[PDB]
Paper text:
The most disordered regions for both structures are the N- and C-termini.
IgE antibodies to Can f 1 can be found in ∼70% of patients allergic to dog extract. Fel d 7 from cats is the most closely related lipocalin and is 63% identical to Can f 1 while the rest of the lipocalins are only 13%–25% identical indicating that these two proteins are from a distinct evolutionary lineage from the other lipocalin allergens. While Can f 1 shows electron densities for most loops flanking beta-strands, some Fel d 7 loop regions are disordered: Arg44-Trp48, Glu122-Gln127, and Asn158-Glu160. The negative charge of the acid head group is neutralized by the positively charged environment of the calyx, either by R101/K131 or R102/K132 in Can f 1 or Fel d 7, respectively. Indeed, simulations with 2 oleate molecules confirmed that 2 oleates could remain bound for up to 3 μs to Can f 1, however 2 oleate molecules only stayed briefly bound to Fel d 7. For both Can f 1 and Fel d 7, approximately a 2:1 ratio of oleate to protein was measured.
Author numbering: 27 to 44, 49 to 122, 127 to 170
The structure:
Amino acid sequence: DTMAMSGKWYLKAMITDRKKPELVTPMTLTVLEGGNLKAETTLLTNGQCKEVELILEKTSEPKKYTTYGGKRVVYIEPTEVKDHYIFYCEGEQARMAKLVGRDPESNEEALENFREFLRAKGFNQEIFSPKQSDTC
Ligand SMILES: [Zn+2]
Ligand SMILES: [Zn+2]
Ligand SMILES: [Zn+2]
């Protein structure tokens, strides 16, 4: 269900096919009317705390959303552990994959699923793990 995804999450691993954050805060997902989602997080890049607020608009395809006014498409895929999910972002023109989990602790089996996902989508395996912090 959509409501299940609401609440706090941690950005645990990132990769791009083609601005590495030196620090990331937890991510909050809020379920808006109509099944749409709001994603809020803060990132420290170049010594500056930059807030990031995204609206993911539900589409006719489940687990598929659009953001930046249709400029980007975002897919949300589960893993074998109930509290970790894969976000796959594509559009304007780069690709990005993120592992998100409900806790910030290292998780081997979610990481194994993430690497398998990266292989199926043709990313490399040079994964980046941002440093975690409650406040920016
Ligand atoms: Zn957990
Ligand atoms: Zn495994
Ligand atoms: Zn294992």
